[PDB]
C-alpha cells in the first residue's frame, strides 16, 4: 500500500529527519518491499521530513 504519514512505525529505522533511505539489498527485499520502501515511505519521509535542497 501507500503507507501514510504516521505509517512509519516499524519503518522509521528507514525514515530520517535529514535524508537516509535503505536501498534494496540494504534490507534484502524484493520488488514489492523495496518498492514500498522507496515510494510509500515518501509520503511520510519527503513532505515535511526531508528538506531536499533550497
Amino acid at each position: 500500500t501507500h503507507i501514510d504519514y504516521k505509517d512509519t512505525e516499524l519503518l522509521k529505522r528507514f525514515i530520517s529527519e535529514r535524508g537516509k533511505i535503505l536501498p534494496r539489498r540494504v534490507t534484502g527485499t524484493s520488488a514489492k518491499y523495496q518498492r514500498m520502501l522507496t515510494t510509500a515511505i515518501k509520503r511520510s519521509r519527503h513532505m515535511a521530513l526531508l528538506p531536499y535542497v533550497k
Binding site: 528538506p51 531536499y52 535542497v53 533550497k54
Partner: protein, 114 residues
C-alpha cells in the same frame, strides 16, 4: 564587547577567502585571498588566513572571539589552515560549519543547493 565574531569562510576547492565578520552580517574586515598578496581561485593556500587574519583580528581586538566558527560552503586546502590565523594570535577555533544550503527551493527554477 568581547566574544563576538565569525570567520565566515567563502572557501571553495580554491579561493581560500574568509570574512572576519560579526556572527551575523555586518562584515568588519578580513585577511582573505585578496588580502595577503593573492587574488583568489588559485589561492588554494591558507595565507589568506594562515597567520595574517589574526593580525586583523587582534588589530581589531573587539571580537575577543573564543568562538570564531569558520563557516564554509565548499572544500579548500588552505581553509583548514585559514583557521591558523585564528590560532596564530589564538582566538580559540571552536566550530567548523561546512554546510551548503537546505532551505527550500522557490520555483520553476531559480536555483539553490545541490
Amino acid at each position: 564587547n568581547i566574544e563576538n565574531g565569525v570567520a565566515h569562510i567563502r572557501s571553495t576547492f580554491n579561493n581560500t577567502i574568509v570574512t572576519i565578520t560579526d556572527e551575523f552580517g555586518n562584515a568588519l574586515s578580513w585577511s582573505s585571498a585578496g588580502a595577503l598578496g593573492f587574488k583568489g581561485s588559485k589561492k588554494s593556500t591558507p595565507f589568506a588566513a594562515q597567520m595574517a587574519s589574526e593580525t586583523a583580528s587582534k588589530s581589531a581586538m573587539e571580537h575577543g572571539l573564543k568562538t570564531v566558527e569558520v563557516t564554509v560552503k565548499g572544500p579548500g586546502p588552505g581553509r583548514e589552515s585559514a583557521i591558523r590565523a585564528l590560532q596564530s594570535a589564538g582566538l580559540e577555533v571552536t566550530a567548523i560549519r561546512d554546510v551548503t544550503p537546505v532551505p527550500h527551493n522557490g520555483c520553476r527554477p531559480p536555483k539553490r543547493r545541490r
